[PDB]
Symmetry: C3
Subunit: 307 residues, 3 copies
């Protein structure tokens, strides 16, 4: 258990995990215990696993340890408000997947790695960083005393690793557009069926996108401050693009700061609002994420106007 | 001994310890040896103690290792210019107290810890961080080979730990206002008596405030640059307050930068000038701190005007 | 071998080593193998040496590990395009010298160390930091399993250490002006002779300056961004000068930012263009460095105008 205020507010979708890093591991363990149960993991193994995962996130402005636990919390909130839908293994796997989904991130996009000709791009032609995140996850699990899935049968172990793999790959935003489009069609026609594994994998994929982007679903003061972190990374990549003799897209171009308000508008309209609209259609109890997304859209519109 | 320039200028109240971190331990050892004597501490134990204290200060903009040694230097200057007043134990304890007085500081105020519902606030209802600083000090002393007070009698050990405890607690600025007010009254009436232990504890408390705030007693270029560090911390806390859904006070509000000159004025008038005025009354050789404080007040007045 | 793009573009003088730190060691090993040969160093010893050198560079804005490898690359490009001129030992020694030439740099100039009265200034009256860089190099070589020159004869070992010493000392820009002037005279009169050791030492000295300053020979986007790093250091030193009660020169004065374009002009005209002009005269295949320097001069002239 946690302090009184945290216990209460952790159940809210728009919860912020706070600036005290050494409380984040305990926040995660709390979430796991309420989501899966106190006997889902051996506590000693789990804590060892969490600290090794922490050590393999880098000190970058956005794709860091705080992001990992923040993404995990959003998944916790989704799971707790749709608690009859998911199995034991899925709850286990998804929280872990979220915690590990950006492991060893450098603060650079897949396209930058390709243009730089980074060895990872030679190894992984598609979803380069995401395949690397999964590879890192697996490597940590293979460390002595780190296999938190020790007590599972081989059959169950293979299932949860596949849940984790698919989920981490789904955080490649390039795959989200096609996935969301398919889910929309299946929802409208009544074809969508959570008993169908391929349909289920898609819904989980959308859940992963929703959690990954959850910065846009916090209250305005948090959403606005987090934007500074995201652009710190993007502008750094844009600097590196210019060093390769390539003009970066405006989003990554430090010199085009004034276009931020309009750029944000475009993203909410093109990416965020559709993501949470579709997720809310499929899983109605995720409605608060959509409301908060809409509220942040209203705030960016006011910045553009000058209010 | 130190380089020629340092030897000379370390005796000045407005000395700056410089940007070379690995010289700060030697600066402290120099001060201890001149203040208490070369046989006050076993050198090997003292160096081990200093390095563990350094390791338990965090990389924050202001409440860091540099602040700790800077505070210790101000106490050194007070002690050397009032050298007949204090006992062996008090000189020992006060330098150590100053070095440890912000141990494990996160860069957040007591009020923020309370509002966040941080576990330390549940443990320590009053002077939350200061009670924690003392707890940290004690923990370091209990480490193998770290008890720098090994050679003291039990009686003396208990006295110096109490000197340290009271001194560290006195750095809670919330307790300064009441303390200064009492000292003022006792000074005016002739009641004040350094042979009275409770009166003595108050004077030491004021000395601790004076050392803690000594940023405002450096020369203008140092005082102005240090302000950047202090606001880096304050504005970060104000950001966190906004993330809890609480509007921070203007001092901690990044958006109210233009109010800095006037805010500083208010602090010098309400806090700093009274502190050093009262200290100078009680201990006349601390006069240079008051003069330099007044000079910085004049500089902030010129910023407001535009000069 | 390296990724395809790196293999190709590493041969260009204006190559940028990129933002992936863990590739820099492999970039260096690649350069050594192509420059000297695959049997010049025992690979295990070399990698151990490289990692210890990395550990002894500090996290400062400019005089860091990236600068060290960048300087080494420029020397690689000079060596590969003048491949018949230099001996086995010289190629070995110069790459190593470049990698170690700023070892343990604090981000402060020799003059600041003198004014602060830093112990290094008492030890080394001339070329203070450069003598320290060499001392650090030697200390690393003396570590167990770190003597990468193990297989050399004593005679050869002494020669390469002297090559390294002279080369590192030559990176003291204060010595460059006199050296360049002498080389100019010897070139014009036909006196200059690479078979004369003292003349040869001078030419190597100029090569070291050219590599050290090679920031001004990159493409404009790299050159412009690197300027931010250099001023971060300079302005920090200027801050420290003000803390000693000394007005810093405008270059190190944060308050005189607007003078950057004109200040840069002056440096290109007074230092950079003459350096690469003289180097190109002596070693014609280094011409691309001069062209790129001239192009950056044109860019700074356009900043001044407003284009
Ligand atoms: C893919 O872009 C983003 N991913 C995000 C994840 C969390 C929060 N925001 C995210 N964003 C973008 C950043 C903004 N989009 C743009 N900003 C600019 C700025 C300047 C010029 C063009 C653009 S597009 C939303
Ligand atoms: C408690 O405030 C401070 N503690 C200090 C310790 C050392 C040096 N300065 C200290 N200060 C304050 C910072 C300033 N006071 C204020 N600044 C502002 C800025 C904006 C709006 C209101 C205020 S009050 C003196
Ligand atoms: C010695 O100065 C420099 N060393 C450099 C090495 C690499 C790249 N640039 C270097 N520079 C200087 C920085 C600039 N010179 C000046 N800048 C200013 C700025 C303000 C006022 C005076 C000056 S001189 C070239
Ligand atoms: Zn990702
Ligand atoms: Zn992510
Ligand atoms: Zn404090
Ligand atoms: Zn303090
Ligand atoms: Zn140097
Ligand atoms: Zn250098």
């Amino acid at each position: 258990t946690l302090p009184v205020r945290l216990c209460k507010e952790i159940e809210l979708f728009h919860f912020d995990i706070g600036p005290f890093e050494n409380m984040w591991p305990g926040i995660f363990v709390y979430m796991v215990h309420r989501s899966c149960g106190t006997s889902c993991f051996e506590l000693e193994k789990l804590c060892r696993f969490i600290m090794s995962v922490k050590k393999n996130y880098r000190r970058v402005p956005y794709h860091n340890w705080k992001h990992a636990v923040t993404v995990a919390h959003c998944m916790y909130a989704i799971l707790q408000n749709n608690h009859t839908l998911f199995t034991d293994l899925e709850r286990k796997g998804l929280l872990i997947a979220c915690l590990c989904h950006d492991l060893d991130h450098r603060g650079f996009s897949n396209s930058y790695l390709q243009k730089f000709d980074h060895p990872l791009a030679a190894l992984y032609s598609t979803s380069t960083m995401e395949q690397h995140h999964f590879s890192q996850t697996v490597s940590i699990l293979q460390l002595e005393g780190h296999n938190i899935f020790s007590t599972l049968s081989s059959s169950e172990y293979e299932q949860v690793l596949e849940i984790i793999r698919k989920a981490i790959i789904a955080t490649d935003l390039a795959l989200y557009f096609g996935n969301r489009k398919q889910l929309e069609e299946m929802y409208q026609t009544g074809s969508l069926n959570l008993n169908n594994q391929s349909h289920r994998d898609r819904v989980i994929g959308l859940m992963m996108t929703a959690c990954d982007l959850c910065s846009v679903t916090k209250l305005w003061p948090v959403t606005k401050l987090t934007a500074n972190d995201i652009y710190a990374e993007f502008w750094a990549e844009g600097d590196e693009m210019k060093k390769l003799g390539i003009q970066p897209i405006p989003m990554m171009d430090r010199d085009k700061k004034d276009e931020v308000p309009q750029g944000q508008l475009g993203f909410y309209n093109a990416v965020a609002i559709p993501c949470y609209t579709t997720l809310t259609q499929i899983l109605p109890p995720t409605e608060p994420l959509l409301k908060a997304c809409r509220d942040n859209l209203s705030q960016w519109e006011k910045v553009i106007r000058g209010e």
